[PDB]
Structure formats: structure tokens, C-alpha cells
Coordinates of C-alpha atoms (C1' of nucleotides) in Angstrom, one line a residue:
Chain A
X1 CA -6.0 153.0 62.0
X2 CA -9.6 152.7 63.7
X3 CA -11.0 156.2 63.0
X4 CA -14.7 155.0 61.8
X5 CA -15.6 153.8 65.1
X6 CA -18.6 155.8 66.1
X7 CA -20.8 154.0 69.4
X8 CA -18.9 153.0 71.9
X9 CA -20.4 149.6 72.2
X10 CA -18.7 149.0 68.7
X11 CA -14.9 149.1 70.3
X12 CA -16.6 146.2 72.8
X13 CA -17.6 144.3 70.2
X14 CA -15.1 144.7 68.0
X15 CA -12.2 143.9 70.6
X16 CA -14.2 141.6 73.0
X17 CA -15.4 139.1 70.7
X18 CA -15.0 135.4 69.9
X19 CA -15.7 135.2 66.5
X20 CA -15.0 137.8 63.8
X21 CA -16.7 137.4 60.8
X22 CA -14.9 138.0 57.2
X23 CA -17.7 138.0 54.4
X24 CA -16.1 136.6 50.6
X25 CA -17.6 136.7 47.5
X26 CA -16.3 134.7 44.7
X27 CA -17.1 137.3 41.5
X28 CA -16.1 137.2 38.2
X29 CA -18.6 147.9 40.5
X30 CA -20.7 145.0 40.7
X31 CA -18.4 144.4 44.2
X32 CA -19.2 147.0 45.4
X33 CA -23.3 146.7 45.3
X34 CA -22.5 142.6 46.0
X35 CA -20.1 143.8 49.3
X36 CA -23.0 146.0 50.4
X37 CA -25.3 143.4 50.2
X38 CA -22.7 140.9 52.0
X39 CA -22.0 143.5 54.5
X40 CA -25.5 143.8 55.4
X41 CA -26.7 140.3 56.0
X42 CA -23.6 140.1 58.2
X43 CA -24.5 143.0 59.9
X44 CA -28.1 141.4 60.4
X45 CA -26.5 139.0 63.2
X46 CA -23.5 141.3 64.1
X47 CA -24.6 145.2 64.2
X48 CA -21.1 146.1 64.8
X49 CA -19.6 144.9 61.8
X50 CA -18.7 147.3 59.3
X51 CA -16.0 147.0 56.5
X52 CA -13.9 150.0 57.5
X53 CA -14.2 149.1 61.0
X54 CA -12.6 145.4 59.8
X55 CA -9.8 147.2 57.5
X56 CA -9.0 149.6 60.4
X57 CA -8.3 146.3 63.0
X58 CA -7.0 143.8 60.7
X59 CA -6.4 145.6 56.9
X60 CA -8.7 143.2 55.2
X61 CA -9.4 145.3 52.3
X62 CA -12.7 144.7 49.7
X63 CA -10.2 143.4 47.4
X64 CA -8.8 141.2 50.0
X65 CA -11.8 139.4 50.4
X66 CA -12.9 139.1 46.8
X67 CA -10.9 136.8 43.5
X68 CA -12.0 139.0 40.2
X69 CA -10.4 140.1 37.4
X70 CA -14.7 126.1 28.0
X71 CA -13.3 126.6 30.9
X72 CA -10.0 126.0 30.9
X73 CA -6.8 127.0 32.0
X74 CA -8.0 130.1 33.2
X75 CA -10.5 128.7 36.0
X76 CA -7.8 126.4 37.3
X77 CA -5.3 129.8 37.0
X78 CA -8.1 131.8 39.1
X79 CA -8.4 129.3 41.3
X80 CA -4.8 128.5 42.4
X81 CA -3.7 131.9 42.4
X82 CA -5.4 133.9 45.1
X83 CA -8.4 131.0 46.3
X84 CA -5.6 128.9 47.6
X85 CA -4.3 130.6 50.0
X86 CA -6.6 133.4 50.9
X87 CA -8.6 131.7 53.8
X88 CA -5.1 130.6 55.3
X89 CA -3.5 134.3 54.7
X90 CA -7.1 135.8 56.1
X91 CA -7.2 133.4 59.7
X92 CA -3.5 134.3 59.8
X93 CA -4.1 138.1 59.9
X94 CA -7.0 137.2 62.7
X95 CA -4.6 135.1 64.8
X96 CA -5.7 134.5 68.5
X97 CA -10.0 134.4 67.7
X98 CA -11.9 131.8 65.8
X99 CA -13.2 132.7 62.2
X100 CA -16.9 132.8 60.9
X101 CA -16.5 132.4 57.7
X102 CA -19.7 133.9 55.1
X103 CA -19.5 133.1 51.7
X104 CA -21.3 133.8 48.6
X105 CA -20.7 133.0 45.0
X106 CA -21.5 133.2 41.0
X107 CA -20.2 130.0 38.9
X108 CA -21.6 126.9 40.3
X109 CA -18.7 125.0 38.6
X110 CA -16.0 126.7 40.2
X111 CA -17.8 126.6 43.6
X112 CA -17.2 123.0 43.6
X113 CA -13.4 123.9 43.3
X114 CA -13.5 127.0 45.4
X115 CA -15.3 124.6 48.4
X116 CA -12.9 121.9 47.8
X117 CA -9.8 123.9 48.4
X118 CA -12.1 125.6 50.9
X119 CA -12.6 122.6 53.0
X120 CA -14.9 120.6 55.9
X121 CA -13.0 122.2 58.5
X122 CA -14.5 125.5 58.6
X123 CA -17.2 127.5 60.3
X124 CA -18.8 128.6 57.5
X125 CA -22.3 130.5 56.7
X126 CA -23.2 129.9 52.9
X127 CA -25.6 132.9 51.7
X128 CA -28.0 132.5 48.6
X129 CA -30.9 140.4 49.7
X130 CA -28.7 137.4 50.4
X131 CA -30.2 135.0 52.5
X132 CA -28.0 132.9 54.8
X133 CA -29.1 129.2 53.8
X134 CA -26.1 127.1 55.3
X135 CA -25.3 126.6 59.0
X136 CA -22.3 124.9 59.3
X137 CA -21.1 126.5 63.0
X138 CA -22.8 126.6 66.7
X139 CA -24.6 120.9 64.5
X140 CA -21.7 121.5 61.4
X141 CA -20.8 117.9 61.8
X142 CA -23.9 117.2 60.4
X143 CA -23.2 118.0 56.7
X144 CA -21.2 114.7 56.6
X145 CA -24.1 112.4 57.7
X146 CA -24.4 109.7 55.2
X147 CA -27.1 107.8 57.5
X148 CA -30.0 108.4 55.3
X149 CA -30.8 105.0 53.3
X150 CA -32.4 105.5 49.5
X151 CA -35.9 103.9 51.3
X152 CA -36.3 107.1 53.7
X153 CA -35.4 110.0 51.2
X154 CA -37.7 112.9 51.3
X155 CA -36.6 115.9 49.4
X156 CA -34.2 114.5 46.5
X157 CA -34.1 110.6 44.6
X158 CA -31.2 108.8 43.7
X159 CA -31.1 106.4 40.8
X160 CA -28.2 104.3 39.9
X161 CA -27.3 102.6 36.4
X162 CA -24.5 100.9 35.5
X163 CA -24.2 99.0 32.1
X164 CA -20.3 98.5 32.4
X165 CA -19.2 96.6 36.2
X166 CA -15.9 96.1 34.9
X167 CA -15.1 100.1 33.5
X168 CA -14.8 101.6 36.6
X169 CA -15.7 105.4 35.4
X170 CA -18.9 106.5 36.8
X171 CA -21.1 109.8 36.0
X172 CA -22.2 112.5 38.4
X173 CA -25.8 114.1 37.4
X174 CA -27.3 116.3 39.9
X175 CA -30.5 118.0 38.5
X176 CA -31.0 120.2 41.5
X177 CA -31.0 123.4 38.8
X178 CA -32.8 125.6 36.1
X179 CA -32.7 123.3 33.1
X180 CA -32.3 119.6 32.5
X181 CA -29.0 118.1 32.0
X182 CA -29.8 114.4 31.9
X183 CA -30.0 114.3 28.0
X184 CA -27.3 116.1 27.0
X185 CA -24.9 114.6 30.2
X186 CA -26.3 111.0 29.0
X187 CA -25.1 112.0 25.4
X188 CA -21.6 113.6 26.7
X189 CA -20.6 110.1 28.7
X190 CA -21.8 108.1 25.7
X191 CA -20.1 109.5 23.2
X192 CA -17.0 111.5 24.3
X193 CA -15.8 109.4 27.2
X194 CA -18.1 106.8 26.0
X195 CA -19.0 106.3 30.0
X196 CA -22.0 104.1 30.3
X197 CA -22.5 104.3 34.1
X198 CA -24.3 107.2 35.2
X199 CA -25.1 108.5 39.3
X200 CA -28.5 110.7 38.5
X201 CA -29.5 112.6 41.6
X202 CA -33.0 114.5 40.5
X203 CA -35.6 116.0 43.0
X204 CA -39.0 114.1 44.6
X205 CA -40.8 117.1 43.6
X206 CA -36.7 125.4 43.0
X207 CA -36.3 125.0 46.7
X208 CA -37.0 126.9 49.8
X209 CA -34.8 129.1 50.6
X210 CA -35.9 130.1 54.1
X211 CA -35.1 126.6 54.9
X212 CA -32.2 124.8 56.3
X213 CA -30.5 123.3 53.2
X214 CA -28.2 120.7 55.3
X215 CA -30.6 117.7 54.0
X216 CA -30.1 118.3 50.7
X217 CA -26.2 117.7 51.2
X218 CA -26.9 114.4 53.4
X219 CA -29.1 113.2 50.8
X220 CA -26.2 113.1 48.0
X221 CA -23.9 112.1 50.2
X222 CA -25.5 109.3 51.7
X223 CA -26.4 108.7 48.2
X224 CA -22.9 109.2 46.5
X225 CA -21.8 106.4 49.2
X226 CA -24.5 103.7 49.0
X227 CA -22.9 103.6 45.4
X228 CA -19.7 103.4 46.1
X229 CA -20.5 101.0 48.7
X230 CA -20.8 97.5 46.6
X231 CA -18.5 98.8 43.3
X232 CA -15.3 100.6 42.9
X233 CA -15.0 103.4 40.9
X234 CA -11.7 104.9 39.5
X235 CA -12.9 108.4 38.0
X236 CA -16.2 110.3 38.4
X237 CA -17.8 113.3 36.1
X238 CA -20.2 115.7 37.4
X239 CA -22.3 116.9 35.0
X240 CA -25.6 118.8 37.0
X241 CA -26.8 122.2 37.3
X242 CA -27.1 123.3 40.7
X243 CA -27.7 126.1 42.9
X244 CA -24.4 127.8 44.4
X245 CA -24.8 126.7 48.0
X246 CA -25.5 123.5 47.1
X247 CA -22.6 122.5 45.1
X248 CA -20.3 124.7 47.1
X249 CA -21.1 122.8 50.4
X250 CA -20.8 119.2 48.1
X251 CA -17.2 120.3 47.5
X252 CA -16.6 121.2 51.4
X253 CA -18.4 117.7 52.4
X254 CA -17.0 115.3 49.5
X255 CA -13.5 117.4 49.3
X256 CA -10.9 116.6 47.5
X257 CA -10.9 113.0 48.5
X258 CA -12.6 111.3 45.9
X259 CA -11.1 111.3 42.4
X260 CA -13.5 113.9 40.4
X261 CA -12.9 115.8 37.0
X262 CA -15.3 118.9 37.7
X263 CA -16.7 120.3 34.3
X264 CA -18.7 123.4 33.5
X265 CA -21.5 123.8 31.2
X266 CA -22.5 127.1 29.3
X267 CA -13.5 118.4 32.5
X268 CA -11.6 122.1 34.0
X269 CA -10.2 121.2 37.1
X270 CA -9.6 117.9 39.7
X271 CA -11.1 117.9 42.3
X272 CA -8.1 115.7 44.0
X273 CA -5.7 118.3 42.1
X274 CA -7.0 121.3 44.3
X275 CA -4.4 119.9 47.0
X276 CA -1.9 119.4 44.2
X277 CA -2.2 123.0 42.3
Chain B
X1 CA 13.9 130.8 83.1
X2 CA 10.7 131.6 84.0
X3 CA 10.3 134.7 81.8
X4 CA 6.9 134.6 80.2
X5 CA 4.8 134.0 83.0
X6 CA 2.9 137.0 85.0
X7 CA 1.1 135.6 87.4
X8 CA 2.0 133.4 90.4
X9 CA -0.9 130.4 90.3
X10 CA 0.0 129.4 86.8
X11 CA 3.6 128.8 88.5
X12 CA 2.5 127.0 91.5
X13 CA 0.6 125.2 90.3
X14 CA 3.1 123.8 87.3
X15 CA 5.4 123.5 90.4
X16 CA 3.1 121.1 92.9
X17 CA 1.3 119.5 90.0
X18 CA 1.4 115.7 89.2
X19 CA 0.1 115.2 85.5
X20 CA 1.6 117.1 82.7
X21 CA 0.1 117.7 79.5
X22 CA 2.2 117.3 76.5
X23 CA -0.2 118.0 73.6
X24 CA 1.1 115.9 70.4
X25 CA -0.4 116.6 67.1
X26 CA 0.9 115.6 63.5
X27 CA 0.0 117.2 60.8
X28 CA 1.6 117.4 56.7
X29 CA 1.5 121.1 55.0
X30 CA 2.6 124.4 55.9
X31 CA 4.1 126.0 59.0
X32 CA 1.6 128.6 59.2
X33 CA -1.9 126.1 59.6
X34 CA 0.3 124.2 61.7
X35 CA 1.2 126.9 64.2
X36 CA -3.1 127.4 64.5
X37 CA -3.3 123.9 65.2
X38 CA -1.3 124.4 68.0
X39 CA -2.9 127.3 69.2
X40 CA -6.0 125.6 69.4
X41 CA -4.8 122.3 70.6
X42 CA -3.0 124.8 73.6
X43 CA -6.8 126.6 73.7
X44 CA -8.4 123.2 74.3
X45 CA -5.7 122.0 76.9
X46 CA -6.0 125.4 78.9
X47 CA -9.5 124.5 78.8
X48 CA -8.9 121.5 81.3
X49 CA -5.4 122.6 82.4
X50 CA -5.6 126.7 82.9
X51 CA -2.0 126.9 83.8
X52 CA -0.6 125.6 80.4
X53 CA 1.1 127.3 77.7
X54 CA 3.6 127.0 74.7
X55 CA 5.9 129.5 76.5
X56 CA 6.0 128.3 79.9
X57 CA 6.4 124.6 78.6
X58 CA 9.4 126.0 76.7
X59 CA 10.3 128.0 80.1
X60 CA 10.2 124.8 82.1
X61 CA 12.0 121.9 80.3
X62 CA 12.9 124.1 77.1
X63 CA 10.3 122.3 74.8
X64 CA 9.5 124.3 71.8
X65 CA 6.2 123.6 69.7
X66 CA 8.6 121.2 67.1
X67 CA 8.9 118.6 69.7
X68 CA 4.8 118.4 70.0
X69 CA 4.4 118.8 66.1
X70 CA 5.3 115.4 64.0
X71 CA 4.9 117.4 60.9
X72 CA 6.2 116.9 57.5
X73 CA 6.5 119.2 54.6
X74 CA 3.7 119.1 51.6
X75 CA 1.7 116.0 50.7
X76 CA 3.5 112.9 52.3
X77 CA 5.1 111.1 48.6
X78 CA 2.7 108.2 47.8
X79 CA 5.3 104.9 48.8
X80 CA 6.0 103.0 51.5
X81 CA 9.1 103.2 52.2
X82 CA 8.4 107.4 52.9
X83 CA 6.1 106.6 54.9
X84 CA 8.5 104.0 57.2
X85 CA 10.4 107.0 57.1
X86 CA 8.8 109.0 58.7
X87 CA 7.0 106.4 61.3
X88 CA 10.8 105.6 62.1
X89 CA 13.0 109.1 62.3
X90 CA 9.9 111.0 63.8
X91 CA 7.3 109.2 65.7
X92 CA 9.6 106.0 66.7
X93 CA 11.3 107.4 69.5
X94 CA 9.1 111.1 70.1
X95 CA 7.3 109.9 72.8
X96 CA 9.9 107.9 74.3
X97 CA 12.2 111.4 74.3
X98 CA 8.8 113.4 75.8
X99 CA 8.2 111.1 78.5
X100 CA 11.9 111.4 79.5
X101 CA 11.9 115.2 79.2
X102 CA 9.6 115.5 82.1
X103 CA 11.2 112.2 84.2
X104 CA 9.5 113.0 87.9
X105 CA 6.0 114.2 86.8
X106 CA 3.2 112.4 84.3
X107 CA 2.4 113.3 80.8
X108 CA -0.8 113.3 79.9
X109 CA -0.6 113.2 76.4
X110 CA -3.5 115.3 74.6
X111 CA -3.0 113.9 71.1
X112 CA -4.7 115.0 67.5
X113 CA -4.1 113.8 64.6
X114 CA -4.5 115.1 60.3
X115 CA -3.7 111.5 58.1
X116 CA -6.2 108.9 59.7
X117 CA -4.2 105.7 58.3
X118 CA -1.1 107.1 60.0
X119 CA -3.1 107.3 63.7
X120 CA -3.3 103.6 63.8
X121 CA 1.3 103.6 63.7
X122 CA 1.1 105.8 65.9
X123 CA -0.9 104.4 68.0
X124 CA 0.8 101.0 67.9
X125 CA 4.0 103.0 68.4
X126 CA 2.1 105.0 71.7
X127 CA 1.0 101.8 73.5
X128 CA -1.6 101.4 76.2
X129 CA 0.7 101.8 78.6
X130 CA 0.2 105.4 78.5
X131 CA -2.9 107.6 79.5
X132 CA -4.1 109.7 77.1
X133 CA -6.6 112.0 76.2
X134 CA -7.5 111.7 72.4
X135 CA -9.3 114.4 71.1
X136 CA -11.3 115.6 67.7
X137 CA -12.2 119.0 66.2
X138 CA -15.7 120.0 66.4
X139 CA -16.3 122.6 63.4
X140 CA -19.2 123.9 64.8
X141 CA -17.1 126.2 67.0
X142 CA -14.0 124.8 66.0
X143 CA -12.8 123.2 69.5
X144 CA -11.5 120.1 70.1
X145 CA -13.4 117.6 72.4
X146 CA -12.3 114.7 74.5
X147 CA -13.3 112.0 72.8
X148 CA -11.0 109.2 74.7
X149 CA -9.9 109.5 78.4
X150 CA -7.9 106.8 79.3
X151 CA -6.3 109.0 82.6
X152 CA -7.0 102.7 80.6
X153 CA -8.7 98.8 81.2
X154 CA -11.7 99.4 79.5
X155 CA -9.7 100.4 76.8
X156 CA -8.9 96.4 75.8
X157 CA -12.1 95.4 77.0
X158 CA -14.0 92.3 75.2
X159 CA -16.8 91.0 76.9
X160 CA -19.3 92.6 75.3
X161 CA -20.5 90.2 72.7
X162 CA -22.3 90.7 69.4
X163 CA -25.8 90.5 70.5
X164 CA -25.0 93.3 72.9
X165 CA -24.0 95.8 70.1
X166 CA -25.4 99.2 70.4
X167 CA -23.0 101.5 68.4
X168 CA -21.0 99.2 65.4
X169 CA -22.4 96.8 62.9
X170 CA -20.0 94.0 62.4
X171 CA -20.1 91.2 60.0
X172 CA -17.5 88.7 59.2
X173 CA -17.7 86.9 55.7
X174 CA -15.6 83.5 55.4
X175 CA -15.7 82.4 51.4
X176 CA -12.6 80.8 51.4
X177 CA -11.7 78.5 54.9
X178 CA -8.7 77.2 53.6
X179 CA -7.0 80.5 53.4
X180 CA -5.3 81.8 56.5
X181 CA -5.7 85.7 55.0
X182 CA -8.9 88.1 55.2
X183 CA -9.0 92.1 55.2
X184 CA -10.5 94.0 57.8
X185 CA -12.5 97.0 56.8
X186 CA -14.1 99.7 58.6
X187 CA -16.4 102.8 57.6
X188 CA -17.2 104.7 60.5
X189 CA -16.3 107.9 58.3
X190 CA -17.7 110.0 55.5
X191 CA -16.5 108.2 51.9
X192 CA -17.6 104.3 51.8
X193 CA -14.2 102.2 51.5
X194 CA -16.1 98.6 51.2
X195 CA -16.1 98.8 47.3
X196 CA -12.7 99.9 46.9
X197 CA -11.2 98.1 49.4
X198 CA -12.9 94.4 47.9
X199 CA -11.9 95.3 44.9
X200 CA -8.1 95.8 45.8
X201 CA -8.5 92.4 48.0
X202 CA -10.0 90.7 45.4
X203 CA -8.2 91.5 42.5
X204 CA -4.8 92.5 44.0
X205 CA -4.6 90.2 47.2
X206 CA -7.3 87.7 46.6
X207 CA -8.6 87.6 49.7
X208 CA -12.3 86.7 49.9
X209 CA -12.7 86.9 54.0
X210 CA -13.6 90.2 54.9
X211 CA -14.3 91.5 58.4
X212 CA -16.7 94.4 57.8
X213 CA -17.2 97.2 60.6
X214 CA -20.1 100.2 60.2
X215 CA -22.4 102.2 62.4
X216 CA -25.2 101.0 63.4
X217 CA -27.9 104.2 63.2
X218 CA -25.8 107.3 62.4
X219 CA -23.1 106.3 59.9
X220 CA -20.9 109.6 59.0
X221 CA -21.4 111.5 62.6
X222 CA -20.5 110.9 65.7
X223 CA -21.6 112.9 69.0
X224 CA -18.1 114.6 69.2
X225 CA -19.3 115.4 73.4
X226 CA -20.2 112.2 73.9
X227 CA -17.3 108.9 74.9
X228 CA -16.2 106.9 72.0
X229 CA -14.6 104.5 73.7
X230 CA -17.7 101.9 73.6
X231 CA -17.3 102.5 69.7
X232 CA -13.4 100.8 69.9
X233 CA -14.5 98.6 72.6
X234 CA -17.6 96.8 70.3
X235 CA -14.7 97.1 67.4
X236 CA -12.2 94.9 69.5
X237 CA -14.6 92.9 70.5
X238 CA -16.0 91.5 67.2
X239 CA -12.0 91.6 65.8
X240 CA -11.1 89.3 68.8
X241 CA -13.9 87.2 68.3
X242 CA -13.1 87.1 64.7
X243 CA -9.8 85.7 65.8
X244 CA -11.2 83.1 68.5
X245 CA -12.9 80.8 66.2
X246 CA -10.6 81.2 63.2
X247 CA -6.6 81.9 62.9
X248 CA -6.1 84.4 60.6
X249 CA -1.9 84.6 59.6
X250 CA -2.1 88.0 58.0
X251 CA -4.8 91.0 58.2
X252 CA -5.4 93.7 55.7
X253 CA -6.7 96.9 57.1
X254 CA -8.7 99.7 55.3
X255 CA -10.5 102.0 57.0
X256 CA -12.6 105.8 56.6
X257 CA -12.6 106.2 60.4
X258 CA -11.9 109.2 62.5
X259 CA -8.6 110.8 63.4
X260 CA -9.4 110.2 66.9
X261 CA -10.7 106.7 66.7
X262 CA -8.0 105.7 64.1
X263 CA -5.6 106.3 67.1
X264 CA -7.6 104.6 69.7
X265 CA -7.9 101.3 67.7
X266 CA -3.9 101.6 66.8
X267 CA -3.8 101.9 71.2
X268 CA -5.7 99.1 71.3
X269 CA -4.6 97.2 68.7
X270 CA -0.8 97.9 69.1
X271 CA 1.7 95.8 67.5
X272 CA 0.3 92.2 68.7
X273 CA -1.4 91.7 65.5
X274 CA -0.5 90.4 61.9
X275 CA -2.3 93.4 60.1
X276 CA -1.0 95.4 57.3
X277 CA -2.6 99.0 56.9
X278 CA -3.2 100.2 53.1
X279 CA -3.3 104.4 53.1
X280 CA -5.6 105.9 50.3
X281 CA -4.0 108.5 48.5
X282 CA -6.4 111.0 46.9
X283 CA -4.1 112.7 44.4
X284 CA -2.8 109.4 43.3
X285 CA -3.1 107.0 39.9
X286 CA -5.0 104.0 40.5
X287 CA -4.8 101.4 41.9
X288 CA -4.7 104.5 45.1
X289 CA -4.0 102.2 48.0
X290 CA -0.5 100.7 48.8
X291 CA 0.3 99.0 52.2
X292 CA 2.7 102.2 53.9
X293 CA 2.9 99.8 57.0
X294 CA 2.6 96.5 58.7
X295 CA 1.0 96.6 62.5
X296 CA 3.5 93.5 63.5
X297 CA 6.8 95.0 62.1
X298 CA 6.8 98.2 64.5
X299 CA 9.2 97.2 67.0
Chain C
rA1 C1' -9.8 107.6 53.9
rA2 C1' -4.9 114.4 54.6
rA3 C1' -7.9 116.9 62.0
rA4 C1' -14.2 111.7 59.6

RNA sequence: AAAA
């Protein structure tokens, strides 16, 4: 029932409009202040939008826009039981317009899963007051541009090393984060899954936040692919700390494609499981 | 029975009209992401063709959206014979029965695809004898786009030669002469196949000729607004003129290419080729590709 | 490489 309308111009907006956005969080009352905050940056670009204006036209409640409640059986648990299917429900209940998707999180390690199962095929804003620091709609295409060869990189550098051509099980460090993982990823491969072949991806000099971040994403994926250009690779770790825009929008561009075994620092999930489970 | 129709142009014009649209899309999951794949595959078409719906289609040769869907339940199983299966049952004779449901007016087929290895079968199994537009979602503001008009010559075009390429990068490695086998490889997508795909030839084929297809400037994107067909016309070009010099008795095809352009090389292609097409299966044990089809066995 |  629409009772919270209060200018006129709303009901225009709210019934003439292409695109209606549904903010998500992905948290672990702290909704509450984080719903505020997400319904405010929304309403930075789209002064009609208002949470009880969106539950009066299409009943998506606070709770229907938010999953809460070693990682383990749990994270793939959370993951498969309401991540799954909640952008398909959501675009369902919003039927006949297009979906603008804007999407904030808190564990970096299940953002790689959440974007996976999220996927490369939606219009998506990706906020890090939030600050909207992903433009994937209006130019999206763009996140999958693996053009950029290791000579002209600018903001991140890729290093390589293999030791083992024949063991096809490669390591995924991305040191794009708060504290260092390099040591104690380099000691995890060599003497756990005693991997020797490691895919380092550390910055050229955390980052801007005003900025566009789409670079950062073709960087490791142009990277990630000039690797597995000239060897073949059966399994691949991540092991990085990362902001969560940056891995979330790795796991919409790589997807669950490539074989990957995500793990969380303080494997969990596959990453070609998210289609499976 | 014309009973979900209002307005009067929409019907003459479907009445005094000469090209149909018959939107064909395949896709493998649920009914409900399928049913919004329709809706904006009949968004796009209304686009171009104002007068088209799912209703009035179904109100004027009793067409539901089933017909224009080759869809499949869950992830397709991981063999080869499923996937003959489903090339045969489904996509064998569906356009054969759509272009005889609409006998005195043309289709014009507006075709999208989900599994890229499966585009090429179907295009093998669509033939250039049919105009086409082949489209591709742009998720900026997630629309389709024309990518292909063929409503068809320069479609199996050659003469543009290697030194004239603007858009592919094609090499053509020969290691082995005496062998009458190489695997043809393209990467005009967003995961690099090369490694993968050498490795399978070479250690589960042993095939050391490879015919190797990438973008020239922009590898991973494609202008979605602007024509691919010069991209398909430089790719047929350097595969005929692989096959001039050399005879090749068997191909091996791998590719991370788009939906769109996965169907346009199976057009062009067709079945007048010896090429086998190996499917990567992401939620699969290694090795993860497995030949699902041969080009040459279709018919 | 399962709407690239």
C-alpha cells in the first residue's frame, strides 16, 4: 500500500521510470544505520527513492534486501541459502523495468562468492558515507577488458613464478589490502598444499576512492590471462587482502568460470561450485 | 483469435507485413530468468519491429514462448552424448518447424544465445541460407544490440587477406607437416583458452599445428554498437587460407568467443568442415574439455 | 569458454 508518498513528482518517478534501484548490503541494528547510509547515496542520484516508498510498490522489505543472521560450512550455508536466489527473486518482483543494482559489503572473502553467484550480467553500482566507486551501467563492458599488456601497467604489477611446469596448481596473491599476505600465503602453498607456483598481483605504489576503480579490475584480469595464456592450470588459491569492491567486481568479471577454491584469512567455497550449490 | 491486441496499426501492419520476426534464444536454468530473457529479447525486437509481441505471435500462428526458447533444465550433464541430445531432439528440426509455421511471410530470426560452444551447432544447424539478426546483451543498460545483419554474401566473404587485417590477429603454427590434424583456437573473449587448449592437444590429441585467432588492439571488448561481421569475415579468411596451402583431415576447435560471434562463425562455418568443437565445463574434474560435437556429422 |  503506497501511503508515504508525499510530492507529487514522487508518484512520477516512482511509476514513470526505467530503472528502479534496489540497494543490498551483504552484513554479518547495525542494518539499520548501514540501510540509512545505503539509502542515502541512492537517494543522491534518485531523490525519489525511499525505502517505504519501495516496500509500498514492490514489498521489498529491509530484510529482503539484506543476508544476516575458519570459514566453513557456514559461509557456503549463508551463501547458498538466501544469496542464490535473491537477485533472481528481487528482478522477478520488478518484472517489466530494468534493475540498477547497488551493492555494498563486509567480508572480502565471501564477496568473491557473493559476486560470483552475482554475476557479469548485471547493472550494478559497487559503493565503498558510502561512496559509489564502480560503474558498471550507462561502458560496463569494460570490466572485462583484458587488453592491457604487463609493459603498459600503471596502477598495479604482476609478477609470475612458477618452479613446478608440470603441477598444474597455481596461487592467487593480490596485495591490494591493509597488511601483507605474501609471506604467510608463500608459506601456506609451500607447506600445506605444498604449491610452488605463485600469481602475486601487488601495487606500483590505499587507493583513491573518488576515482573510477574499473582499471584496477582490467589490470588483474589482463594479468590473470597473460598467465594462463602459455600454461594450463588445473586449480587456483587466492590468498590476498583486498578492498570489498575490488574483489567483489573480480568475482562478477572472472565468475565462476575458472576453477578457484576461495579461502578467508582472519579453501571455504568454489568458485565453480557457486553454480553447483 | 486476435484477443490481446488493442490497437489497430499493430494489426495491420502484422497483416500487410513481409518479414517476420521469430526471436530464438537458448538458454540452461530456470524458467523464471528464462521468461526475462524473453522479455527483453521481445523489448529489443519491439525496438526495430513496434508491432511485435509474445501474445499476438501466439494470437496469430499459436506460437507460445517454448517454441522460441531451446532451453534445458539445470547445468547441461558434462558428456557428449547429452549434448547430441539435445542438438538432435531440440535444435535439429526447431527452425525447420518455425519457418514452416509462418509458410507465406519471412522470418527474420533475432537469435541469442547463453552456452557459447553450443552457438557454433547451432549455427551449423541454422545455415546461411537464412537472414538473421544475431544479437548480444550490452550490461550497461542491459539491451541487446545488433551485432550481425545478414537481412548475407559478405557473410562468407574471403578476399581480405592477412596483410589487410584490422580487427583479428591470426597465426598458424605447422610443427609437424606430416600430420593431416591441427586445432583451431580462438580468444576473442574474457578467459585465455591458448594454454589449456595446447595442453589438451598436446597431451591428449597430440596435435602440434595450431591455428591461433586473437584481437588485435582491444582483446576482451568489443563495441557491442558497432558491426562484427568484419571480425568473422578476417576469421574465415585466415581459416580458408589456412586450408588453401595445407589439407587439414580433421580440426579441433576451442574457443572463449562471444555468444553472438560463436553463432556467426557456426553460420559461416556450417557443416562443410572436418572440425570437432571441445565445450569447457567449469564445474567439472579435469581434464574440463570433451568434444560434445563434430561440425561435419550434423546432417 | 553457461547471454564474452
Amino acid at each position: 500500500l503506497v501511503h508515504r508518498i508525499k510530492k507529487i513528482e514522487q508518484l512520477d518517478a516512482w511509476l514513470n521510470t526505467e530503472t528502479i534501484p534496489l540497494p543490498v548490503i551483504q552484513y554479518q541494528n547495525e542494518l539499520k544505520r548501514w540501510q540509512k547510509a545505503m539509502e542515502q547515496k541512492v537517494q543522491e542520484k534518485f531523490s525519489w527513492f525511499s525505502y517505504e516508498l519501495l516496500e509500498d510498490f514492490y514489498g521489498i522489505t529491509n530484510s529482503d534486501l539484506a543476508i544476516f543472521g575458519f570459514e566453513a560450512n557456514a559461509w557456503q550455508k549463508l551463501l547458498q541459502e538466501q544469496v542464490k536466489d535473491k537477485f533472481k527473486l528481487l528482478e522477478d518482483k520488478v518484472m517489466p523495468k530494468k534493475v540498477l543494482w547497488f551493492y555494498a559489503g563486509q567480508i572480502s572473502t565471501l564477496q568473491l562468492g557473493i559476486g560470483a553467484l552475482f554475476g557479469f550480467k548485471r547493472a550494478v553500482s559497487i559503493l565503498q558515507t558510502y561512496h559509489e566507486v564502480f560503474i558498471l551501467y550507462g561502458n560496463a563492458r569494460q570490466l572485462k577488458n583484458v587488453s592491457v599488456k604487463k609493459e603498459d601497467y600503471q596502477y598495479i604489477q604482476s609478477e609470475l613464478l612458477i618452479n613446478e611446469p608440470h603441477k598444474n596448481e597455481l596461487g592467487f596473491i593480490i596485495y591490494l589490502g591493509s597488511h601483507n599476505p605474501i609471506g604467510e600465503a608463500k608459506a601456506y602453498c609451500q607447506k600445506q598444499l605444498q604449491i610452488n607456483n605463485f600469481l602475486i598481483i601487488q601495487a606500483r605504489e590505499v587507493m583513491e576512492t573518488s576515482q573510477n576503480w574499473l582499471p584496477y579490475l582490467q589490470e588483474i584480469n589482463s594479468a590473470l590471462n597473460t598467465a594462463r595464456q602459455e600454461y594450463h592450470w588445473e586449480r587456483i588459491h587466492l590468498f590476498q587482502t583486498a578492498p570489498t569492491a575490488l574483489c567483489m567486481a573480480l568475482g562478477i568479471a572472472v565468475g565462476h568460470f575458472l576453477p578457484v577454491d576461495v579461502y578467508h584469512y582472519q579453501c571455504v567455497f568454489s568458485l565453480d561450485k557457486m553454480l553447483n550449490l
